[PDB]
């Protein structure tokens with residue numbers, strides 16, 4: 424059981440060592456499409472690429488590329504799209520992907536500015552009466568409502584396909600309090616946030632996969648999916664303590680490289696799952 428494993432690694436301070444074994448065991452697949460020179464300005468970080476086998480393809484004939492990966496967790500019946508924070512020139516691609524994949528929710532785990540640099544383009548409208556048009560992908564986006572709480576903001580958005588005049592409601596879940604450095608002290612507000620996304624229906628098989636992003640789409644985004652999948656497997660299995668976080672992380676790393684960036688994020692993922700298990704048992 425992971426509670427005992429947590430105390431062991433913690434008391435022995437072996438987090439950097441566990442983390443290195445995961446790094447060495449992790450899959451490596453080709454990322455040829457990401458490295459094409461025509462896609463250079465579609466990537467925020469040159470060292471963070473989707474694998475060709477799991478990459479999301481845009482349905483535009485010109486260039487189908489976006490830095491986004493489909494993570495398919497077969498046993499848990501959960502899918503997620505993990506992507507980078509959009510760039511100024513990829514905001515239209517981002518919303519085209521949301522439209523094409525029939526996603527109901529967008530989960531954002533970063534602020535637009537952190538450590539005095541831009542981590543993400545401002546890709547949603549700030550006021551009801553100032554809608555955004557993406558001319559390149561023929562989509563209109565309107566802020567319908569905004570509910571600001573202490574740790575997170577939920578926004579209702581209307582996305583309209585200008586080509587067909589269909590409209591969908593998208594929920595934007597914005598976790599606003601992840602610190603500039605390190606991880607939250609307690610996983611309580613992160614768990615609260617995860618239960619709010621679950622309650623919305625955004626993670627349900629009726630809809631396309633939820634879109635999850637931070638700046639690179641591997642660190643905080645990784646923590647989100649890892650905690651959700653681990654807690655769901657504890658509901659589903661005859662023996663809840665058969666759930667090995669390290670195994671789940673390695674299975675997720677077959678779909679996108681680098682998920683969980685630091686030993687601190689690994690420790691925080693254990694803590695979130697251990698604490699979340701109390702609300703689930």
Ligand SMILES: Cn1nccc1C(=O)NCc1cccs1
Pocket residue numbers: 463464465466467468510
């Ligand atoms: C145009 N270009 N040549 C090489 C790399 C790039 C590029 O645009 N990379 C992504 C980012 C743009 C601004 C912040 S990050």
